[PDB]
Ligand binder design. Sequence first.
Ligand SMILES: N#Cc1ccccc1-n1ccnc1
Length: 209
Amino acid sequence: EVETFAFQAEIAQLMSLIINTFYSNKEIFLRELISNSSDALDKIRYESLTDPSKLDSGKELHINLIPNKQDRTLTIVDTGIGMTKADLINNLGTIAKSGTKAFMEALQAGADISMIGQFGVGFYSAYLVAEKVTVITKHNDDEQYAWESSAGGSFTVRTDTGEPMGRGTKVILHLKEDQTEYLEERRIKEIVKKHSQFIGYPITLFVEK
Ligand SMILES: N#Cc1ccccc1-n1ccnc1
């Protein structure tokens, strides 16, 4: 049972700007997703201080980076707080509306796409390098869901029948044909060292078989 939704016009406009604008410094997508993971880990850690049972779904707080050349995917996995169905369908897009408008205004005033995270909509920089994004997520208060979009104005949400995650989020980047450098170990190491060196959680870069 797959549900198809329309993006709000403003978010669809943001996605088209990310896809269509000429902008060579694409590597910042990884910093933006890792920053999102770190924020989600901060949240579950803070909540667990006053309710230890929130970690019954997993005590480990970490980030895994998993390249797969066979699938041409880069997956960013965290064990953070995860997202609810309402987050996926409405809450996060609602918040992103104001950040998008401010980001668009800043771009016309001289900012560049690398500053997208200062407006709270860094997730959408995934479309700098990905033709399709699949997000698997599990929040303590909700079921496991798969969100997916190839842009074009729509996204889908379904209950995920796959391997249970416990708690957290998996962002699966189906990379564009000319963006496979982000599957190379040395390239990912370089980018993590450059932009994510002080993240307060272990980042494990998986090796390919
Ligand atoms: N990750 C993520 C995500 C997935 C679906 C919709 C919105 C999302 N999002 C936007 C900003 N932070 C998170």
